[PDB]
Scaffold this motif. Structure first.
Motif, PDB file in Angstrom:
ATOM      1  N   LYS B 186       0.808  -1.220   0.000  1.00  0.00           N
ATOM      2  CA  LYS B 186       0.000   0.000   0.000  1.00  0.00           C
ATOM      3  C   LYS B 186       0.843   1.272   0.000  1.00  0.00           C
ATOM      4  O   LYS B 186       0.267   2.367  -0.016  1.00  0.00           O
ATOM      5  N   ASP B 187       2.170   1.177   0.010  1.00  0.00           N
ATOM      6  CA  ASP B 187       3.030   2.353   0.049  1.00  0.00           C
ATOM      7  C   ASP B 187       3.980   2.478  -1.132  1.00  0.00           C
ATOM      8  O   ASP B 187       4.412   3.590  -1.439  1.00  0.00           O
ATOM      9  N   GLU B 190       0.932  -0.315  -6.529  1.00  0.00           N
ATOM     10  CA  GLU B 190      -0.418   0.109  -6.866  1.00  0.00           C
ATOM     11  C   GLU B 190      -0.967  -0.793  -7.960  1.00  0.00           C
ATOM     12  O   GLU B 190      -0.235  -1.570  -8.578  1.00  0.00           O
ATOM     13  N   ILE B 191      -2.272  -0.685  -8.189  1.00  0.00           N
ATOM     14  CA  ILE B 191      -2.977  -1.498  -9.171  1.00  0.00           C
ATOM     15  C   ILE B 191      -3.671  -0.573 -10.162  1.00  0.00           C
ATOM     16  O   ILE B 191      -4.392   0.346  -9.759  1.00  0.00           O
ATOM     17  N   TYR B 192      -3.455  -0.819 -11.450  1.00  0.00           N
ATOM     18  CA  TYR B 192      -4.140  -0.098 -12.514  1.00  0.00           C
ATOM     19  C   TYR B 192      -5.260  -0.971 -13.063  1.00  0.00           C
ATOM     20  O   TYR B 192      -5.048  -2.154 -13.347  1.00  0.00           O
TER      21      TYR B 192
ATOM     22  N   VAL F 201      -4.796   7.588 -15.831  1.00  0.00           N
ATOM     23  CA  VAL F 201      -5.187   6.249 -15.399  1.00  0.00           C
ATOM     24  C   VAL F 201      -5.700   6.174 -13.974  1.00  0.00           C
ATOM     25  O   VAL F 201      -5.269   5.362 -13.169  1.00  0.00           O
ATOM     26  N   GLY F 202      -6.646   7.019 -13.653  1.00  0.00           N
ATOM     27  CA  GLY F 202      -7.229   7.002 -12.335  1.00  0.00           C
ATOM     28  C   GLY F 202      -6.212   6.624 -11.350  1.00  0.00           C
ATOM     29  O   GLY F 202      -6.292   5.605 -10.712  1.00  0.00           O
ATOM     30  N   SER F 204      -4.775   5.962  -8.251  1.00  0.00           N
ATOM     31  CA  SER F 204      -5.541   5.716  -7.037  1.00  0.00           C
ATOM     32  C   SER F 204      -4.747   6.067  -5.790  1.00  0.00           C
ATOM     33  O   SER F 204      -5.128   5.696  -4.680  1.00  0.00           O
ATOM     34  N   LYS F 205      -3.641   6.780  -5.970  1.00  0.00           N
ATOM     35  CA  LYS F 205      -2.823   7.168  -4.826  1.00  0.00           C
ATOM     36  C   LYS F 205      -1.997   8.409  -5.134  1.00  0.00           C
ATOM     37  O   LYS F 205      -1.750   9.233  -4.252  1.00  0.00           O
TER      38      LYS F 205
END
Ligand code: CLR
Ligand code: CLR
Lengths: 8, 226, 340, 232, 61, 281
Positions: B186-187, B190-192, F201-202, F204-205
């Motif tokens: 989570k740091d 990431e997921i696209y 691409v959205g 998300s962070k």
């Protein structure tokens, strides 16, 4: 007065 | 110094030119984008003839002054633990999935689920000692088949602790959130996410954007700004 | 059924017979017999030469028969032949498959073979009228990643692969002439005898099989490990061999007797063993651990007789020349160091 | 492999001409290049050495600053441009498939080569033998001597022999007096140490007669021995 | 009903692996010690040698 | 109060020396010139370390007023310190340009960041600095003091009449103007490009992550401004109008010329450790 690094 | 004869001078020149060739060829593979393709096998992985094209299987294609290399390793049939460390300088390990066939529950054993197997594969590929600092992208499925099956039968209620039903937008959002919430880092990872369509450009522009984002993030981490 | 149950009972009975037959002949241990001889002094080896040129991890190397040449295989897609005297590079051979796992050097110095994770073993001919290193013929027929390959002669080669089978190939015909089966786990390493008549192997199921080259049948199975096996090698005498596992233990077996003679365990290191090699007289054991360092052991009292630390990454391959002049170590940082 | 060279013929002292060489079946761009000046019916000398990729250039003393050499890697062709000539430049040139790495011999595969007729460390040259009649079935011995100890620290001795036959371009026979070339009969042999070296033939017949030359390999412009004809 | 053949093959191999001779540990230990003592005279690693006969020595350049 | 000024001089010199020697030791030992930023950090650390070698002599000039070191020593140290002052800043500008090229353009102009150009770049920037200090090392000498003592300062040439307005304007307009605009534009474009690709691409962070970059930009620009504005502004104020010689104005001037040196010890802290070298150290 001063002109530079050391004032004179 | 001068003890070398005319033989050793030519030997040293040969070694120097071999070094020159090796160094020159070692800079061409540094700027080539290395992708790893993985899936359960019945997850649209055969749809490369049009989506990405105009032991280990390798395919090459170019899009907007970039070189892409994905290695399909689904047919190796070996213990994954003993050879997984080879793919270390990889970016954007694609995991093509197909969860539109989950509601039509096919287990291949009659005691499993497609969603359980997908989560197991995701955890196995995202929770290794290696692969840290490696981004992931997702290709959920073609949206046509899911709609035809969700509306006719409210079998989505079989999903563990799900309240809504007969909603196309909400079920897909819940699936996407469930898939995205599987990381433990989570740091740095990431997921696209992308929803596939019949148009080929929609499934390639997303990959280009994701890899560009990964490269920008890597450069920011390298230069110390981040 | 009843037949399966009685066959399992018979197999258990034969296993017990093997176990008690092995235990009956265990009258002493190697350490208490060799304790008489005085220990060797503290050995120190300095980095005589350092070899550079690879741009990725190094997986295997093979000392040539001239005690002065060797090859290296790495994931960047290059095969390089080295000259240990002037650190020169003799040949740079491109590969069709960018993934390799092992390499070998022919006893006559004409052939080099490398393959892995591609289900194919290729044989390269060095001394050719074309002046280059072109593949003689390409061998196919395996369904798993190849882990090791060794040249029995100028025309016979024995290989191990990821499909838990070892097959004795024939370069002339291009087809297998003998196939060895029986491994439940995946086979990872093998070694050849000086007379080229018997050879053993190690697999991921913590088992070692003694095979025969000619009639192609197994005679003896060795056990005692509790983890995967990566490297193995015979003794110069030809009546013993040493094994290396991932549980920080190296064990010495022998061919003529079915017992365990000599084992290694140290509490200060919890990393596995990636390569094992012997010297001329076999007095000292070389075992390149993966804890960023390499260790030199003594085969008298299981006492470490020195350390050899020059790498900053994983140690993958080792090797000692035929005349025992020098020992070379390899590592994933793409640096080969020759120690004397 | 086959290696065709051109440029042979008669050339005037004042003029320009270019030599040609074609390498097929082997990598012309990974083999050291050389040139040899074969003086007929007498001792001969070595000409020039250019490594693969034009890394280094060398010239003979007698033709220094007088000839021009140009290489074409894409066409696998090495040229030779001339400005002025002297009567002592008649030569038989050999592009030799031989590059200096351990286990390989200089002047290993001479290919074919071409001629050159010019119209009108460096051990000294010596070979006393001129011609010796001999009957097949007995050993034949000839001697070639040096002036300095060729036993270096490594022990390499740079002594080469090649046999010439009438109407045929000579090829390599024996190098180092310890290693025999390939594609040649096993009957040829040799042994020597220190300063004096002697070539010995085990068995003699019609095809083992020819003109031998002893070469030294020290200063790349090296001097070669005289011709010793053998008569049946 | 195909497991009977595999079980029979495994039982055959297990019972057939027990047809070799064995020796005492002391004999093997003595043989190893004798070989080591006899061949220790030509072990460059065991006995350090001067740079005169060492071909991998470090020079000035 | 000049004694406390000397202790400040000495402690600044010690801190900068220790920081730069630690950085240079770590890099030289096991950085092995792997990343393109390592060579730039190497020259920055070398430049600051050589810059802060003339500090004790200027301290012994400001306090213990007379100059025992001598005429040749005065000129040599004022040339070395004048070259090293201009050597460090251009390295910062080059690093900023490299960062902008690396982040905003990841596909193009990323095949020109190999660990080689930097060398050529380093040699060229040292050569460019050399020429700049020419007038300083060809116009300086010994000037008579109205205090009845000796010192080590710059003489008054006749090249541009007064010349202490022209010289100061030229030095200001180059050294303070060009790097500040360059770094500000580069960092602004970096922020803009990070913002632009975040919403394709959205991300998300990234949305949340696009604040550390802004903080780093703000800190960098703020410190570079703080360490350089007081000296130039006081010098140009003295140039513009003459003022009666009093100890109070000269007393603060010493601290003013102190902070300019003091921004050499903090430079490694902000440029080097705030990177992937955290694992290295
Ligand atoms: C210890 C330091 C502060 C002393 C300062 C003196 C400077 C000039 C020293 C310190 C480190 C040294 C450098 C160390 C590394 C190299 C690599 C070499 O391929 C070129 C020279 C170069 C660049 C050295 C040149 C001299 C050098 C730069
Ligand atoms: C004004 C100058 C001449 C006096 C200071 C000399 C030293 C400190 C300067 C002058 C030239 C500079 C060098 C020129 C280029 C390189 C190559 C680079 O890969 C390492 C740093 C290095 C080696 C620089 C280090 C600092 C340097 C050595």
């Amino acid at each position: 007065x001063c002109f530079x690094k050391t004032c004179x | 110094g001068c003890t070398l004869s005319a033989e050793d001078k030519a030997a040293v020149e040969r070694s120097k030119m071999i070094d020159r060739n090796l160094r020159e060829d070692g800079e061409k593979a540094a700027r080539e984008v290395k992708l790893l393709l993985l899936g359960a096998g019945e997850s649209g992985k055969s749809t490369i003839v049009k989506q990405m094209k105009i032991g280990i299987v390798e395919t090459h294609f170019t899009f907007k002054d970039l070189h892409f290399k994905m290695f399909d390793v689904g047919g190796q049939r070996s213990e994954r633990k003993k050879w997984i460390h080879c793919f270390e300088g990889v970016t954007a390990i694609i995991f093509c999935v197909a969860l539109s066939d989950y509601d039509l529950v096919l287990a291949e054993d009659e005691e499993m689920n497609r969603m359980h197997e997908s989560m197991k594969l995701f955890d196995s590929i995202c929770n290794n000692k290696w692969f840290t600092d490696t981004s992931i992208i997702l290709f959920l499925n073609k949206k046509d088949l899911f709609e035809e099956k969700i509306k006719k039968s409210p079998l989505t209620i079989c999903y563990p602790e799900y309240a809504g039903s007969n909603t196309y937008e909400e079920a897909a959002a819940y699936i996407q959130c469930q898939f995205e919430d599987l990381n433990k880092r989570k740091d740095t990872k990431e997921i696209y996410t992308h929803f596939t369509c019949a148009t080929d450009t929609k499934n390639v522009q997303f990959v280009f954007d994701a890899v560009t984002d990964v490269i920008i993030k890597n450069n920011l981490k390298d230069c110390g700004l981040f | 059924g009843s037949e399966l149950d009685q066959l399992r009972q018979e197999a258990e009975q034969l296993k017990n017979q093997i176990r008690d037959a092995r235990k009956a002949c265990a009258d002493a241990t190697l350490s208490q017999i060799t304790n008489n001889i005085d220990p060797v002094g503290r050995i120190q080896m300095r980095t005589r030469r350092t070899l550079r040129g690879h741009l990725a991890k190094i997986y295997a190397m093979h000392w040539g028969t001239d005690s002065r040449l060797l090859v290296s295989a790495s994931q960047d897609g290059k095969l390089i032949i080295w000259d240990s005297y002037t650190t020169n590079k003799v040949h740079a051979i491109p590969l069709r498959s960018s993934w390799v796992m092992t390499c070998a050097y022919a006893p006559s110095g004409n052939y080099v073979a490398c393959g892995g994770l591609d289900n194919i073993c290729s044989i390269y001919n060095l001394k050719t009228r074309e002046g280059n290193v072109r593949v003689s013929r390409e061998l196919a027929g395996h369904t798993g990643y190849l882990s090791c390959c060794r040249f029995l002669d100028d025309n016979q080669i024995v290989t191990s692969s990821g499909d838990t089978t070892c097959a004795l190939w024939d370069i002339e015909t291009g087809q297998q002439t003998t196939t060895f089966t029986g491994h439940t786990g995946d086979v990872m390493s093998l070694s050849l005898a000086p007379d080229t008549r018997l050879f053993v192997s190690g697999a991921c199921d913590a088992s070692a099989k003694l095979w025969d080259v000619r009639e192609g049948m197994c005679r003896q199975t060795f056990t005692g490990h509790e983890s995967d096996i990566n490297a193995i090698c015979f003794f110069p005498n030809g009546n013993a061999f040493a094994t290396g596992s991932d549980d920080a233990t190296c064990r010495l077996f022998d061919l003529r007797a079915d017992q365990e003679l000599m084992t290694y365990s140290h509490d200060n290191i919890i990393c596995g063993i990636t390569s094992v090699s012997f010297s001329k007289s076999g007095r000292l054991l070389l075992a390149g651990y993966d804890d960023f360092n390499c260790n030199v052991w003594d085969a008298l009292k299981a006492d470490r007789a020195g350390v050899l630390a020059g790498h900053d990454n994983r140690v993958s391959c080792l090797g000692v020349t035929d005349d025992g002049m020098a020992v070379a170590t390899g590592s994933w940082d793409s640096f080969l160091k020759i120690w004397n | 492999v086959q290696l065709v060279e051109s440029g042979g013929g008669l050339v005037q002292p004042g003029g320009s001409r270019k030599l040609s060489c074609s390498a097929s079946g082997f990598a012309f761009s990974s083999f050291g290049m050389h040139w040899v000046r074969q003086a007929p019916e007498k001792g001969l000398e070595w000409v020039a050495y250019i490594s693969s990729g034009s890394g280094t250039i060398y010239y003979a003393d007698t033709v220094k600053g007088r000839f021009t050499i140009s290489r074409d890697d894409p066409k696998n062709t090495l040229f030779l441009q001339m400005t002025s000539l002297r009567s002592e430049d008649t030569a038989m040139y050999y592009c030799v498939r031989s590059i200096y790495y351990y286990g390989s011999s200089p002047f290993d595969f001479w290919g074919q080569g071409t001629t050159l007729t010019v119209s009108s460390s460096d051990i000294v040259m010596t070979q006393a033998t001129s011609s010796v009649p001999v009957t097949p079935g007995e050993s034949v011995s000839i001697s070639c001597r040096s002036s300095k100890s060729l036993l270096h620290s490594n022990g390499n001795t740079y002594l080469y022999w090649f046999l010439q036959r009438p109407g045929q371009s000579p090829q390599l026979l024996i190098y180092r007096m310890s290693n025999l070339a390939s594609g040649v009969p096993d009957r040829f042999s040799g042994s020597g140490s220190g300063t004096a070296f002697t070539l010995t033939i085990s068995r003699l017949e019609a095809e083992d007669v020819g003109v031998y030359y002893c070469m030294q390999h020290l200063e790349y412009p090296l001097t070669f021995g005289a011709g010793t004809k053998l008569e049946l | 009903t195909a497991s009977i053949a595999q079980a029979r093959k495994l039982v055959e191999q297990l019972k057939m692996e027990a047809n070799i001779d064995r020796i005492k540990v002391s004999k093997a230990a003595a043989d190893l010690m004798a070989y080591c003592e006899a061949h220790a005279k030509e072990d460059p690693l065991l006995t350090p040698v001067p740079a005169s006969e060492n071909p991998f020595r470090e020079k000035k350049f | 109060s000049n004694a406390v000024l000397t202790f400040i001089y000495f402690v600044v010199c010690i801190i900068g020396l220790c920081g730069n020697t630690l950085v240079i030791y770590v890099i030289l030992r096991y950085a092995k010139m792997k990343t393109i930023t390592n060579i730039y950090i190497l020259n920055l650390a070398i430049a600051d370390e050589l810059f802060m070698l003339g500090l004790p002599f200027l301290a012994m000039q400001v306090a213990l007023v007379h100059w025992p070191f001598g005429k040749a020593i005065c000129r040599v140290v004022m040339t070395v310190d004048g070259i090293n002052q201009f050597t460090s800043i251009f390295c910062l500008t080059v690093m900023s340009i490299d960062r902008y090229l690396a982040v905003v353009h990841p596909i193009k102009s990323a095949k020109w960041r190999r660990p080689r150009t930097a060398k050529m770049i380093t040699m060229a920037v040292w050569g460019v600095s050399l020429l700049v200090i020419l007038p300083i090392m060809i116009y300086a000498g010994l000037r008579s003091n109205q205090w009845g003592r000796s010192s080590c300062t710059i003489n008054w040439p006749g090249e541009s009449g007064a010349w202490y307005t022209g010289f100061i304007i030229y030095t200001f307009i180059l050294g303070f103007l060009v790097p500040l605009t360059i770094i500000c534009l580069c960092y602004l474009f970096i922020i803009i490009k990070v913002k632009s690709s975040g919403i394709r691409v959205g991300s998300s962070k990234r949305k949340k992550s696009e604040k550390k970059v802004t903080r780093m930009v703000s800190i960098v620009v703020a410190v570079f401004i703080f360490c350089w504005l007081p000296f130039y502004i006081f010098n140009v104020s003295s140039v513009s109008m003459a003022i009666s010689p009093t100890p109070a104005l000269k007393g603060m001037f010493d601290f003013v010329v102190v902070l300019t040196y003091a921004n050499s010890c903090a430079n490694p802290i902000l440029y080097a450790f705030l990177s992937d070298n955290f694992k290295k150290s």
